[PDB]
């Protein structure tokens, strides 16, 4: 799967065929040709195949709070088969076993995977006392903390990962995003060096693989919050292997509007450049100017952004969630990754009820891969 | 009046009665019995009694602007009899001498107390000139300063205390609190190192001696301002002899409601603990949790607050004045102290129009104590 294959083979084959003389059209501009095919590499990178393999080498414990949900169940089978992770499912053990039989999956409880019963667990008194000490001043009474552990699955898995019993967690298949996130933020805590949280959704597009943030965490992020979201996204995408091409999208194109939304972007651009100059980023720009290099070079010759951009940053969540939701059905491709939570101290992600099984599979993998490091 | 009397005598008697054998019911928990005795003596305290004695030791000069008002005159008599302070009443001498006779009081002008006539005074030229130099930049012309020295008695007394002719002043029996306070603030100035003022009103409650903060001065306090109010009050309560137990009240119970008011309180708790970690204080909480320790230990066991809390700091003036009014009618007895003004350099206090004659006597003695320091 090495991307460099088409980089060296196709030119070298072309150079020997011109020396052999059987070629009808000489590509005299070999360096331009080299630029053309390296661009094809850069647009389509799988960025999942290395992830899966890394998960296979070191599977980790992942808790899925909504264990009864059928989509979770379908993904648990593929996780056990591919040897990606050690799945811990939370829910009523009786309904899971019945649905497994109806689904026909070969996973066997206590063998292939472990189950934690939400209604009864020996580690109950310890857990509610642990959750209460975090949430006593945040409006959770002792009596409330108990009731939460019996009926809120997401809270149960959060306590495990913080304790150390579980390595990571994947939730959000049932419920609104902010319900699960609220649980996550108070329990795990912000990662050191960060004071804001970022959500990222990825769509393979004609322009290539493309990422969008922030989709659910912040409804109206301020300037410094955008800058921190940008830097984390550049770090995460560099891990995937795709070099980061950041574009701060806005209705204004390089100062066409002086309204506060555009002013917020420009300030963040200066903030990002001062914190880490290496990142390739230019803003603000129209949406189209970030993908078609032809349009951007006409508005901005000396733009530091080169080629189609892959990290599009949004001024407010509404523009993001409406863009990503409209593109997911206008691309019609493999799911790649879903809502990637950035900034949390522990390896956690929250999904949507519309999330497919492949998305849950891919996302559980992504988390196992995060858990290998500390 | 020594509080330590009941704490020591009763246990030794109890031990002697058990050794004698006449004790029908033994008390095995002697250390618990001491705790119940010490809690009773802290609740029913008489901080006013030492204040009178300290005032008797060194009577100081006190100015009362409303010398014609009947309630002040009754209080001048009992002050003269007690020997607490040397009164300097202000008003028309004829109306005072005629009311003195009408009220059947044995006080003579020029000997027991001193009258300063507002309409005519030898030092008139120095007073309105000094007032002008203080208020020339706050909208007071020379012509306005003259009429103001004759018309507003509170202005007259404020000038005296700043000159040093009188050691303190008590006012407010007629008129709005702020009519005198604004004069007090501009003339005396803020206490060194203090940039906001505080109004404290004391009540005798079943739970114990109880004070409320910011009853009249600030409609809405900054978190910084709330902090300085709390810190000053605990210092003043320590002067009375009561142990400072502080509680920040709010409509939210320990983060149950996230609003501007609750956020405002919590920030102050941090600000107070940094400036003085020794002060026992916890918030935010409901009122009942501040008084009934049982309720507080059930929602917050680790609370640093121990027992009934004596210093109640409130979020806004509106809730504080409403509470104080509704409590002074539902608490049977207790003349205690009137509205206490904190943060002003020269010793002074502003009273309510409905302040009882006992409250004028008490608040005059409180001022004499304050004048003995610096």
XYZ file of C-alpha atoms in Angstrom:
748
model
C 0.000 0.000 0.000
C 3.021 2.316 -0.061
C 2.092 5.659 -1.661
C 5.611 6.150 -3.052
C 5.089 3.262 -5.505
C 3.383 5.328 -8.200
C 5.837 8.139 -7.397
C 8.942 6.253 -8.570
C 7.622 3.494 -10.849
C 5.477 5.398 -13.352
C 8.167 8.042 -14.143
C 11.002 5.516 -14.325
C 8.904 3.336 -16.640
C 8.129 6.416 -18.739
C 11.824 7.344 -18.916
C 12.853 3.882 -20.183
C 10.014 3.757 -22.729
C 11.163 7.068 -24.211
C 14.724 5.737 -24.319
C 13.375 2.587 -25.977
C 11.536 4.831 -28.449
C 8.165 3.049 -28.319
C 6.478 6.068 -26.711
C 4.268 8.205 -28.953
C 3.971 11.279 -26.685
C 7.097 12.398 -24.791
C 6.363 13.901 -21.375
C 9.233 16.379 -21.596
C 8.217 17.923 -18.239
C 9.142 15.045 -15.937
C 9.248 17.250 -12.832
C 5.731 18.533 -13.569
C 4.727 14.893 -14.075
C 6.295 14.068 -10.700
C 4.215 16.882 -9.217
C 1.053 15.534 -10.864
C 1.327 12.010 -9.464
C 2.499 13.051 -5.993
C -0.706 15.097 -5.914
C -2.766 11.958 -6.601
C -0.986 10.298 -3.668
C -1.715 13.282 -1.427
C -5.427 13.393 -2.299
C -6.223 9.694 -1.725
C -4.446 8.293 1.327
C -6.179 5.461 3.171
C -4.952 6.699 6.601
C -7.018 3.843 8.078
C -4.964 0.840 6.964
C -1.986 1.804 9.204
C -4.417 2.490 12.054
C -6.098 -0.933 11.912
C -2.702 -2.652 11.761
C -1.460 -0.671 14.767
C -4.581 -1.771 16.636
C -3.936 -5.414 15.728
C -0.437 -5.259 17.235
C -1.732 -3.957 20.603
C -5.468 -4.334 21.248
C -6.753 -2.317 24.189
C -9.855 -2.362 26.393
C -12.728 -0.280 24.978
C -16.028 0.336 26.776
C -19.161 0.865 24.688
C -21.886 2.151 27.048
C -24.841 1.556 24.694
C -24.183 -2.157 24.436
C -27.765 -3.204 23.725
C -27.851 -1.105 20.543
C -27.746 -3.417 17.530
C -25.195 -1.347 15.606
C -22.802 -1.600 18.555
C -23.418 -5.348 18.533
C -22.607 -5.678 14.821
C -19.366 -3.757 15.377
C -18.400 -5.868 18.403
C -18.322 -8.934 16.140
C -15.969 -7.312 13.627
C -13.755 -6.061 16.474
C -13.387 -9.570 17.897
C -12.805 -11.108 14.455
C -10.155 -8.596 13.367
C -8.555 -8.710 16.826
C -8.750 -4.917 17.156
C -9.813 -4.390 20.789
C -11.044 -6.013 24.001
C -14.708 -4.925 24.034
C -16.543 -4.236 27.300
C -20.269 -3.699 26.697
C -22.642 -2.149 29.252
C -26.325 -2.986 29.419
C -28.849 -5.524 30.593
C -27.128 -8.888 30.000
C -30.442 -10.522 29.145
C -31.422 -8.245 26.261
C -27.923 -8.385 24.764
C -27.921 -12.190 24.699
C -31.380 -12.259 23.101
C -30.458 -9.703 20.425
C -27.173 -11.521 19.730
C -29.158 -14.685 19.020
C -31.569 -12.784 16.765
C -28.607 -11.186 14.982
C -26.741 -14.487 14.650
C -23.386 -13.085 15.764
C -20.812 -15.556 17.079
C -19.591 -13.389 19.979
C -19.953 -15.151 23.336
C -20.177 -13.215 26.596
C -17.413 -13.732 29.148
C -15.349 -15.353 26.361
C -14.989 -13.090 23.329
C -16.096 -9.980 25.249
C -16.926 -8.829 28.772
C -20.244 -7.412 29.963
C -20.916 -5.026 32.842
C -24.507 -5.120 34.104
C -25.804 -1.579 34.675
C -28.506 -2.639 37.146
C -26.181 -4.721 39.347
C -22.409 -4.511 39.647
C -20.220 -5.331 42.663
C -18.254 -2.135 41.991
C -21.229 0.153 42.598
C -20.620 1.759 45.999
C -17.100 2.654 44.874
C -18.231 4.138 41.557
C -20.985 6.465 42.794
C -18.699 7.690 45.568
C -16.051 8.309 42.897
C -18.450 10.141 40.565
C -19.871 12.135 43.496
C -16.469 13.465 44.570
C -16.050 14.921 41.084
C -19.620 16.255 40.792
C -20.510 17.264 44.364
C -20.006 20.975 43.672
C -21.365 20.746 40.100
C -24.944 20.043 41.194
C -24.972 16.259 41.691
C -26.344 15.113 45.036
C -25.386 11.802 46.625
C -28.796 10.312 45.817
C -28.571 11.578 42.233
C -25.100 10.091 41.713
C -26.422 6.628 42.559
C -29.400 6.896 40.191
C -27.072 8.083 37.422
C -24.933 4.950 37.581
C -27.928 2.629 37.234
C -29.458 4.321 34.171
C -26.739 6.447 32.533
C -24.411 4.060 30.653
C -22.004 6.807 29.555
C -21.261 7.731 33.174
C -20.334 4.132 34.043
C -17.684 3.822 31.345
C -16.292 7.256 32.157
C -15.514 6.202 35.732
C -13.789 3.023 34.511
C -11.380 4.821 32.176
C -10.537 7.368 34.872
C -9.969 4.555 37.380
C -7.760 2.695 34.899
C -9.899 -0.447 34.631
C -10.764 0.407 31.015
C -8.352 1.914 28.502
C -10.734 3.874 26.247
C -14.410 4.490 25.514
C -16.710 4.939 22.509
C -20.273 6.176 23.113
C -22.947 8.442 21.641
C -24.791 5.917 19.474
C -27.984 6.811 21.381
C -28.697 10.320 22.641
C -27.793 13.907 21.816
C -24.084 14.703 21.576
C -24.002 17.210 24.432
C -25.433 14.748 26.971
C -22.499 12.367 26.605
C -19.927 15.145 26.197
C -20.984 16.817 29.453
C -20.300 13.529 31.230
C -16.913 13.241 29.527
C -15.711 16.780 30.220
C -16.361 16.756 33.970
C -14.917 13.278 34.561
C -11.789 13.017 32.412
C -10.807 16.676 32.370
C -9.236 18.823 29.691
C -5.848 17.706 28.409
C -3.032 19.767 29.905
C -2.067 22.685 27.696
C -5.588 22.986 26.263
C -8.607 24.930 27.509
C -11.150 24.110 24.771
C -12.502 20.995 23.040
C -12.774 20.208 19.354
C -14.849 17.843 17.232
C -13.773 16.802 13.721
C -15.627 14.930 10.958
C -13.868 13.554 7.877
C -15.241 12.988 4.376
C -13.356 11.616 1.414
C -14.145 14.172 -1.293
C -13.330 14.832 -4.951
C -10.763 17.333 -3.668
C -9.369 14.482 -1.553
C -9.605 13.514 2.085
C -11.005 16.514 3.946
C -11.637 17.385 7.594
C -14.044 19.860 9.197
C -14.172 21.357 12.704
C -15.688 22.294 15.024
C -18.982 20.452 14.458
C -20.643 19.976 17.887
C -18.565 21.187 20.858
C -18.731 24.992 20.580
C -21.762 26.740 19.094
C -19.920 30.062 18.642
C -16.195 29.658 19.315
C -14.173 32.734 20.156
C -10.916 33.589 18.408
C -8.475 31.808 20.723
C -10.779 28.777 20.911
C -10.596 28.482 17.122
C -6.800 28.718 17.237
C -6.545 25.870 19.754
C -8.980 23.774 17.708
C -6.797 24.392 14.652
C -3.538 23.382 16.341
C -4.999 20.164 17.768
C -6.460 19.260 14.370
C -3.101 19.861 12.682
C -1.514 17.547 15.255
C -4.140 14.828 14.809
C -4.088 14.912 11.005
C -0.277 14.799 10.968
C -0.605 11.572 12.958
C -2.848 10.180 10.202
C 0.033 10.930 7.806
C -1.679 13.505 5.603
C 0.295 16.726 5.704
C -1.898 19.498 7.177
C -3.390 22.080 4.766
C -5.409 24.433 7.006
C -7.927 26.944 5.635
C -10.022 29.221 7.860
C -13.311 29.424 5.981
C -15.602 32.432 6.214
C -18.149 34.389 4.210
C -15.525 37.102 3.762
C -12.757 36.493 1.219
C -9.510 38.079 2.456
C -11.210 41.096 3.993
C -14.373 41.457 1.905
C -16.333 41.886 5.160
C -15.138 43.581 8.354
C -17.883 42.075 10.536
C -16.945 40.361 13.834
C -17.120 36.838 12.371
C -14.407 37.623 9.819
C -12.415 39.665 12.357
C -12.378 36.677 14.710
C -10.802 34.453 12.040
C -7.962 36.829 11.150
C -6.946 37.206 14.804
C -6.818 33.434 15.208
C -4.661 33.237 12.075
C -2.087 35.529 13.693
C -2.355 33.549 16.946
C -1.736 30.238 15.180
C 1.307 31.545 13.299
C 2.876 32.803 16.532
C 2.335 29.521 18.410
C 3.612 27.268 15.586
C 4.821 28.879 12.337
C 5.365 25.551 10.560
C 1.673 24.934 9.852
C 0.423 25.743 6.353
C -2.641 27.953 6.771
C -4.249 30.967 5.129
C -7.503 32.728 5.962
C -10.012 33.884 5.585
C -11.375 32.669 2.269
C -14.507 31.542 0.503
C -15.251 27.837 0.692
C -14.384 27.248 -2.953
C -11.047 29.089 -2.725
C -9.784 26.476 -0.248
C -10.238 23.527 -2.640
C -9.627 24.808 -6.183
C -6.034 26.054 -6.209
C -6.884 27.989 -9.378
C -9.401 30.230 -7.602
C -7.149 30.941 -4.611
C -4.122 31.906 -6.719
C -6.248 34.466 -8.566
C -7.394 36.171 -5.355
C -4.054 35.591 -3.592
C -0.838 34.896 -5.534
C 1.577 34.581 -2.613
C -0.845 32.451 -0.598
C 1.069 30.089 1.664
C -1.695 27.526 1.088
C -0.728 25.305 -1.859
C -3.316 23.098 -3.527
C -6.625 21.802 -2.263
C -6.998 22.208 1.497
C -7.916 19.293 3.756
C -8.578 20.969 7.145
C -11.448 23.450 6.860
C -12.077 25.457 10.036
C -15.499 27.014 10.568
C -16.548 30.317 12.185
C -19.517 28.797 14.034
C -20.919 25.317 14.576
C -24.058 25.981 12.518
C -22.004 26.564 9.369
C -19.996 23.431 10.171
C -22.842 21.055 11.027
C -24.772 22.245 7.966
C -21.736 21.917 5.685
C -20.744 18.441 6.878
C -24.341 17.190 6.852
C -24.836 18.437 3.299
C -21.538 17.019 2.017
C -21.898 13.559 3.596
C -24.788 12.896 1.204
C -23.156 14.803 -1.673
C -19.994 12.649 -1.587
C -21.460 9.132 -1.091
C -18.222 7.384 -0.152
C -16.714 5.237 2.578
C -17.378 6.624 6.027
C -13.673 6.997 7.047
C -13.897 8.531 10.579
C -16.716 10.225 12.457
C -16.808 12.835 15.237
C -13.243 12.915 16.598
C -13.084 14.401 20.100
C -9.969 16.531 20.609
C -8.709 18.066 23.850
C -10.009 15.493 26.323
C -7.420 14.004 28.677
C -8.554 10.415 28.155
C -9.006 8.596 24.802
C -12.723 9.165 24.207
C -15.056 9.873 21.296
C -18.782 10.531 20.933
C -20.812 9.547 17.885
C -24.274 10.305 16.516
C -27.390 8.089 16.364
C -27.104 8.107 12.547
C -23.603 6.624 12.824
C -23.201 3.480 10.723
C -21.578 0.253 11.883
C -18.438 0.907 9.820
C -18.132 4.275 11.570
C -18.337 2.592 14.986
C -15.798 -0.006 13.845
C -13.436 2.647 12.496
C -13.887 4.885 15.539
C -13.340 2.126 18.111
C -10.126 1.341 16.231
C -9.017 4.992 16.279
C -9.414 4.990 20.071
C -7.452 1.766 20.647
C -4.669 3.361 18.617
C -4.787 6.436 20.858
C -4.501 4.267 23.976
C -1.132 2.778 22.993
C 0.584 6.042 23.986
C 0.627 8.179 27.131
C -20.797 37.104 82.089
C -17.877 34.784 81.312
C -18.977 32.203 78.702
C -16.435 29.656 79.960
C -18.452 29.332 83.192
C -21.052 26.839 81.966
C -18.455 24.883 79.975
C -16.345 24.045 83.047
C -18.733 23.988 86.016
C -21.405 21.630 84.674
C -19.056 18.739 83.684
C -17.226 18.691 87.022
C -20.597 18.724 88.785
C -21.740 15.901 86.506
C -18.614 13.856 87.227
C -19.078 14.523 90.949
C -22.742 13.484 90.837
C -21.867 10.216 89.094
C -19.105 9.515 91.618
C -21.567 10.308 94.408
C -24.042 7.872 92.850
C -27.127 10.115 92.899
C -27.040 10.477 89.096
C -29.988 8.528 87.684
C -28.708 8.884 84.099
C -24.941 8.715 83.483
C -23.322 10.434 80.516
C -20.662 8.215 78.969
C -19.909 10.684 76.148
C -18.321 13.432 78.230
C -16.496 14.922 75.244
C -19.770 15.004 73.295
C -21.470 16.650 76.280
C -18.812 19.386 76.263
C -19.427 19.953 72.548
C -23.142 20.441 73.234
C -22.369 22.928 76.016
C -19.884 24.910 73.922
C -22.348 25.013 71.022
C -25.016 26.468 73.321
C -22.715 29.194 74.621
C -21.615 30.185 71.104
C -25.257 30.503 69.996
C -26.458 32.659 72.920
C -23.746 35.310 73.184
C -23.893 38.881 74.476
C -21.301 40.700 72.371
C -23.061 43.975 73.204
C -22.279 43.774 76.932
C -18.463 44.114 76.552
C -18.976 46.904 74.001
C -20.799 49.048 76.558
C -18.067 48.389 79.137
C -15.274 49.311 76.718
C -17.191 52.471 75.816
C -17.725 53.382 79.478
C -13.958 53.120 79.976
C -13.211 55.870 77.430
C -16.216 57.863 76.197
C -15.540 59.490 72.838
C -17.064 62.401 70.940
C -20.115 61.411 68.877
C -22.138 63.580 66.471
C -25.815 62.861 65.814
C -27.222 64.984 62.961
C -30.922 64.546 63.814
C -30.860 66.215 67.215
C -34.487 67.342 66.962
C -35.804 63.828 66.308
C -37.456 62.323 69.368
C -35.810 58.900 69.092
C -32.315 60.407 69.237
C -33.210 62.515 72.271
C -34.423 59.524 74.306
C -31.129 57.839 73.372
C -29.015 60.848 74.353
C -30.487 60.555 77.857
C -29.738 56.845 78.312
C -26.289 57.458 76.819
C -25.707 60.310 79.272
C -26.924 58.114 82.135
C -24.849 55.113 81.034
C -21.777 57.243 80.376
C -21.142 55.613 76.992
C -20.512 58.694 74.839
C -20.500 62.492 74.882
C -23.290 63.588 72.513
C -22.967 66.465 70.052
C -26.466 66.955 68.648
C -27.138 69.208 65.643
C -30.250 71.263 64.990
C -32.238 74.308 66.003
C -31.647 74.763 69.760
C -35.183 76.034 70.411
C -36.906 72.954 68.996
C -34.553 70.655 70.922
C -35.072 72.446 74.245
C -38.841 72.430 73.718
C -38.963 68.724 72.820
C -36.658 67.833 75.724
C -39.265 69.346 78.036
C -42.132 67.708 76.142
C -40.481 64.277 76.492
C -39.774 64.774 80.202
C -36.023 64.176 79.955
C -33.451 65.490 82.446
C -30.835 66.724 79.966
C -29.598 70.316 79.807
C -27.945 71.998 76.845
C -24.272 72.879 77.177
C -23.501 70.426 80.004
C -24.756 66.891 79.290
C -24.601 67.361 75.507
C -23.581 70.048 73.024
C -25.856 71.568 70.380
C -24.542 72.932 67.086
C -27.024 75.264 65.407
C -27.278 74.650 61.661
C -28.679 78.112 60.914
C -25.859 79.986 62.691
C -22.351 78.833 63.571
C -19.054 80.701 64.044
C -17.083 78.086 62.078
C -19.474 78.201 59.093
C -16.917 79.767 56.742
C -14.321 77.037 57.336
C -16.805 74.195 56.862
C -18.353 75.007 53.484
C -14.866 75.919 52.251
C -13.512 72.513 53.290
C -16.569 70.735 51.859
C -16.022 72.604 48.587
C -12.364 71.582 48.311
C -13.482 67.972 48.706
C -16.510 68.253 46.399
C -15.469 70.891 43.847
C -14.859 68.150 41.253
C -18.044 66.178 42.048
C -20.559 68.858 41.053
C -20.673 71.105 44.144
C -20.216 74.826 43.555
C -19.315 77.289 46.304
C -22.882 78.609 46.424
C -24.125 75.008 46.565
C -21.673 74.178 49.359
C -22.960 77.029 51.526
C -26.653 76.097 51.308
C -25.688 72.451 51.807
C -23.898 73.112 55.111
C -27.036 74.750 56.508
C -29.626 72.353 55.037
C -28.019 68.906 55.374
C -27.068 68.046 58.981
C -25.196 64.903 57.888
C -22.847 67.129 55.887
C -22.095 69.162 59.028
C -21.077 66.172 61.126
C -19.007 64.617 58.355
C -16.888 67.777 58.156
C -16.314 67.787 61.930
C -15.038 64.213 62.088
C -12.638 64.830 59.209
C -11.354 67.934 61.001
C -10.968 65.930 64.212
C -13.359 68.013 66.328
C -15.563 64.941 66.898
C -14.401 61.344 67.026
C -17.362 59.645 65.320
C -20.883 60.101 63.946
C -24.136 58.121 63.851
C -26.875 59.191 61.433
C -29.733 57.967 59.265
C -32.815 58.169 61.505
C -34.527 60.286 58.809
C -33.979 59.919 55.073
C -32.721 57.383 52.569
C -29.600 55.381 53.430
C -27.710 56.618 50.385
C -28.404 60.302 51.080
C -26.108 60.035 54.087
C -23.854 57.300 52.689
C -22.808 59.292 49.617
C -21.852 62.186 51.895
C -20.002 59.732 54.131
C -18.150 58.073 51.252
C -16.950 61.292 49.619
C -15.822 63.029 52.817
C -14.196 60.264 54.859
C -13.007 58.155 51.934
C -12.529 54.420 51.644
C -10.469 52.524 54.210
C -6.861 52.065 53.107
C -6.612 48.847 51.121
C -10.404 48.575 50.742
C -12.230 49.683 47.600
C -15.853 48.741 48.368
C -18.261 49.231 51.253
C -20.467 46.812 53.139
C -23.688 47.045 55.150
C -24.203 44.387 57.834
C -27.348 43.902 59.918
C -27.410 41.648 62.990
C -30.254 39.486 64.280
C -30.825 37.094 67.169
C -32.085 33.823 65.694
C -32.877 30.375 67.128
C -29.882 28.945 65.258
C -27.716 31.544 66.985
C -26.426 35.057 66.495
C -26.754 35.832 62.798
C -25.530 38.596 60.494
C -26.417 39.407 56.890
C -24.109 41.153 54.410
C -24.701 43.968 51.886
C -28.109 44.952 53.224
C -28.110 48.502 51.801
C -24.867 49.615 50.125
C -24.464 47.740 46.800
C -27.426 46.672 44.679
C -25.289 44.240 42.646
C -21.761 43.320 43.796
C -18.802 42.205 41.711
C -17.237 38.900 42.736
C -14.210 40.897 43.890
C -16.569 43.234 45.758
C -18.425 40.324 47.349
C -15.063 38.964 48.499
C -14.007 42.190 50.224
C -17.415 42.351 51.922
C -17.027 38.836 53.333
C -13.463 39.388 54.555
C -14.292 42.654 56.321
C -17.369 41.167 57.999
C -15.449 38.232 59.477
C -12.889 40.682 60.874
C -15.689 42.726 62.443
C -17.383 39.629 63.867
C -14.083 38.510 65.409
C -14.040 41.897 67.149
C -17.407 41.144 68.763
C -15.968 37.817 69.949
C -18.110 35.497 67.826
C -16.298 32.844 65.796
C -16.552 33.727 62.074
C -18.540 31.028 60.239
C -19.391 32.246 56.725
C -21.861 30.880 54.170
C -22.562 32.236 50.673
C -26.278 31.856 49.960
C -27.800 31.435 46.505
C -30.877 30.016 44.829
C -28.599 27.184 43.678
C -27.483 24.411 46.047
C -23.801 23.590 45.448
C -23.902 24.038 41.687
C -27.454 22.782 41.112
C -28.197 25.873 38.973
C -25.520 27.329 36.687
C -26.350 31.041 36.346
C -24.533 34.400 36.662
C -25.418 34.652 40.353
C -24.079 31.209 41.290
C -20.935 31.662 39.181
C -20.434 34.987 40.959
C -20.487 33.370 44.405
C -18.087 30.527 43.602
C -15.398 32.864 42.248
C -15.558 34.808 45.509
C -14.999 31.633 47.531
C -11.713 31.179 45.667
C -10.823 34.852 46.131
C -11.525 34.671 49.867
C -9.498 31.506 50.474
C -6.438 33.005 48.759
C -6.507 36.245 50.755
C -7.317 34.368 53.979
C -7.444 30.531 54.062
C -8.141 30.488 57.820
C -11.712 31.767 57.413
C -14.245 28.936 57.630
C -16.556 29.378 54.638
C -18.343 27.180 52.108
C -20.775 27.930 49.289
C -22.936 28.173 47.501
C -25.881 26.644 49.358
C -29.505 27.097 50.274
C -30.344 29.076 53.382
C -31.475 26.067 55.410
C -28.168 24.276 54.776
C -26.313 27.248 56.256
C -28.270 27.099 59.534
C -29.292 23.446 59.980
C -26.016 21.512 59.979
C -27.967 18.279 59.457
C -29.151 19.349 55.995
C -25.665 20.522 55.034
C -23.847 17.317 56.006
C -26.251 15.287 53.861
C -25.508 17.109 50.610
C -21.889 18.055 51.397
C -20.253 15.944 54.125
C -16.732 17.315 53.573
C -17.995 20.881 54.018
C -15.533 23.022 55.949
C -18.578 24.737 57.467
C -19.187 23.306 60.952
C -22.425 24.021 62.801
C -24.812 26.884 62.267
C -23.287 29.662 60.157
C -23.366 33.144 61.674
C -22.255 35.384 58.775
C -24.666 35.115 55.835
C -23.358 36.807 52.674
C -26.018 37.340 50.029
C -25.949 37.620 46.211
C -27.879 40.865 45.707
C -29.159 43.649 47.938
C -32.766 42.890 46.981
C -32.739 39.397 48.474
C -30.814 40.579 51.545
C -33.099 43.454 52.543
C -36.156 41.258 51.931
C -34.694 38.533 54.144
C -33.647 40.906 56.925
C -37.084 42.542 57.010
C -38.916 39.214 57.011
C -36.622 37.777 59.691
C -36.631 40.693 62.164
C -40.392 40.210 62.380
C -40.302 36.406 62.684
C -37.435 36.450 65.200
C -39.076 37.464 68.474
C -36.439 39.332 70.491
C -32.974 40.781 70.032
C -32.171 44.471 69.727
C -28.605 43.443 68.704
C -26.915 46.004 66.425
C -28.356 48.074 63.604
C -27.064 48.446 60.042
C -23.261 48.341 60.276
C -21.216 50.295 57.711
C -17.846 48.773 56.784
C -15.005 50.125 54.669
C -15.122 53.809 55.647
C -12.044 55.438 57.173
C -13.584 57.534 59.912
C -15.888 55.715 62.387
C -19.485 56.139 61.229
C -22.704 54.186 60.653
C -25.951 54.842 58.776
C -29.249 53.741 60.298
C -32.760 53.014 59.088
C -35.676 55.436 59.491
C -37.438 52.840 61.658
C -34.407 52.195 63.881
C -35.604 51.726 67.456
C -34.278 53.908 70.253
C -32.378 50.915 71.626
C -30.672 50.462 68.252
C -29.513 54.078 68.341
C -28.081 53.536 71.825
C -26.329 50.324 70.773
C -24.963 51.738 67.506
C -23.592 54.825 69.273
C -21.597 52.594 71.630
C -20.301 50.498 68.725
C -18.845 53.710 67.288
C -17.088 54.688 70.523
C -15.299 51.323 70.531
C -14.153 51.908 66.956
C -12.889 55.405 67.769
C -10.588 54.137 70.540
C -8.245 52.382 68.075
C -6.891 55.080 65.736
